[PDB]
Ligand binder design. Structure first.
Ligand SMILES: *C(=N)[C@H](C[C@@H]1CCNC1=O)NC(=O)[C@@H]1[C@@H]2[C@H](CN1C(=O)[C@@H](NC(=O)C(F)(F)F)C(C)(C)C)C2(C)C
Ligand SMILES: *C(=N)[C@H](C[C@@H]1CCNC1=O)NC(=O)[C@@H]1[C@@H]2[C@H](CN1C(=O)[C@@H](NC(=O)C(F)(F)F)C(C)(C)C)C2(C)C
Lengths: 299, 302
């Protein structure tokens, strides 16, 4: 099934940041708190903000940072793209090993949804090819982060900023650069047409084969270039060299060449599933990555 | 908005997980105060699991045969007792990370989070429900026993499940923290099958309300039905009956959407008799039944 990473290492980094009456969540690592810069905005400000001018008027003593009800004094502030960086007087004793990463469309991560600095729930999702995520976020969730854990290292990849009219969500990496062509202004914005994540569908078919569900395999293969041109006709993402590489381990485990699985997928796309299921499903799953299959099938 | 299968944050439980070893058998334990809880079959060899004499096996053990590891540090066992299918190991150090907690026994249909662990180390968290046939549709591998399921209310962890075994159909079975199995199963390595399962009707309706709150409305219709006439059709399709307490607990979702519970029941009735026409609800091709009304209110309202 779809699992989240254990959230404990991130829970110990969640704080709340307040300007005036505007409050959201921040991320406390060592002696720095990271949060969306629109915390410095009033309601009217958000309709058409001048962030450079709003920050010039701000001082350290205007920022209220709290871990629980314990205040952390801000001793410096700066803006990096769409994130604020607030230096505080206390190094977080629960800081884990960590890094900041910018992920690619199709990569999955866990989200720790927080409100008023208080973790509320954890769920798994993926960066869509149109650079949105199908999240679950209510008022006050901004600053919630998405992450992956490898070994003892937390790779932070997403911070939440906004919800689009179609009910999907958009945000930045931890250097404040939006995923996608979105801006942190309350103005009409729309997600592009989404596509299906082909590398992930393939990983899910490999998973099916590993579990003994393999009726969909044909005795044919294709060329990468031929597969990519046909895939786009069904609103499927084309494969990159990196996609073919990260499928290597699953190809080796099953002995099924990547391009042979591509040929099997193409036949599925052309003829559908004749009232048949794969892993108990009539829909092809596209939010399980090859890493997810390995991690969840090996423990 | 949006709607995801959501688990509780797992940090408070991660701080309680440890490793327990007997001979060559290793699994997970739950360290609360100065006691470690774990499945009793940790004391079994391969031959023992095929036909265990648990009380005899435990009388023949001593404290020092139990190797308990928290992180990289060994804890010294100073006592041990057996409560049903659970072993309690008294250790000489209290867990400083112990949360406020209670042990509860849940009813079928209720949901909970599972923190899957291996060798005392947390691996993943996911949301489950207690099936009507007392199994759970988990994801557990070798070494996962002693993983627990829980809910959190404010700052209090309610432990409701500890993992013990996997049935041949791939569903899972375990105990409450008093060591009593959910369902008619035993901690012995012998073929065991579960009763026939049913769908958790009140949960399906809560999820239909979630789909409406999120703008997925295609399955609604202009009709209503009586509670009894709905239950007749539900039971025909192997769905649980809907009680008046279930109707009441759906009230707040009915109020938010303006859709009476018995109006939604008429839509579910039509879904059961006609199928979904290959359409989806909240991106699902099947009716989801592992969100309670509380789960939906909490995620869609706050
Ligand atoms: C931050 N706590 C929220 C998170 C939102 C609220 C409901 N669900 C979410 O994910 N972010 C905002 O309120 C941001 C903030 C001003 C407006 N905004 C929006 O998300 C708005 N959306 C847009 O303006 C749109 F459509 F362009 F995406 C809103 C209409 C409130 C959903 C700023 C700076 C974008
Ligand atoms: C605990 N570490 C494992 C967890 C298992 C391993 C595979 N997936 C799981 O959830 N539990 C066990 O190994 C228990 C333990 C001996 C046998 N067992 C089983 O789960 C076996 N099942 C059964 O014998 C059956 F059919 F009754 F469910 C197994 C065939 C190994 C899955 C005991 C005492 C039950």
């Amino acid at each position: 099934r779809k699992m989240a990473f254990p959230s404990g290492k991130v829970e110990g980094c969640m704080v709340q940041v307040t300007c005036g009456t505007t409050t959201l969540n921040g991320l406390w690592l060592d002696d720095v708190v990271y949060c969306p810069r629109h915390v410095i905005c009033t309601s009217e400000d958000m309709l058409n903000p001048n962030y450079e001018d709003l920050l010039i008027r701000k001082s350290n003593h205007n920022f209220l940072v709290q871990a629980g009800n314990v205040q952390l004094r801000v001793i410096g502030h700066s803006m990096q793209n769409c994130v604020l960086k607030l230096k505080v007087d206390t190094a977080n004793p629960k800081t884990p090993k960590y890094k900041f990463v910018r992920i690619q469309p199709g990569q999955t991560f866990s989200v720790l949804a927080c409100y008023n600095g208080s973790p509320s729930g954890v769920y798994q999702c993926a960066m869509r090819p149109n650079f949105t995520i199908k999240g679950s976020f209510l008022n006050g969730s901004c600053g919630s982060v998405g992450f992956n854990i490898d070994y003892d290292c937390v790779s932070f990849c997403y911070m939440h900023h906004m919800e689009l009219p179609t009910g999907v969500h958009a945000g930045t990496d931890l250097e404040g650069n939006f995923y996608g062509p979105f801006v942190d202004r309350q103005i009409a914005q729309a997600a592009g047409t989404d596509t299906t994540i082909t590398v992930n569908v393939l990983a899910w078919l490999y998973a099916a084969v590993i579990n003994g569900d393999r009726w969909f395999l044909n005795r044919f293969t294709t060329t990468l270039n031929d597969f990519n041109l046909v895939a786009m006709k069904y609103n499927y993402e084309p494969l990159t060299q990196d996609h073919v590489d990260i499928l290597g381990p699953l190809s080796a485990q099953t002995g099924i060449a990547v391009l042979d699985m591509c040929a099997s997928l193409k036949e599925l796309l052309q003829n559908g599933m004749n009232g048949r299921t794969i892993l108990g499903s009539a829909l092809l799953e596209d939010e399980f990555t090859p890493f997810d299959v390995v991690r969840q099938c090996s423990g």
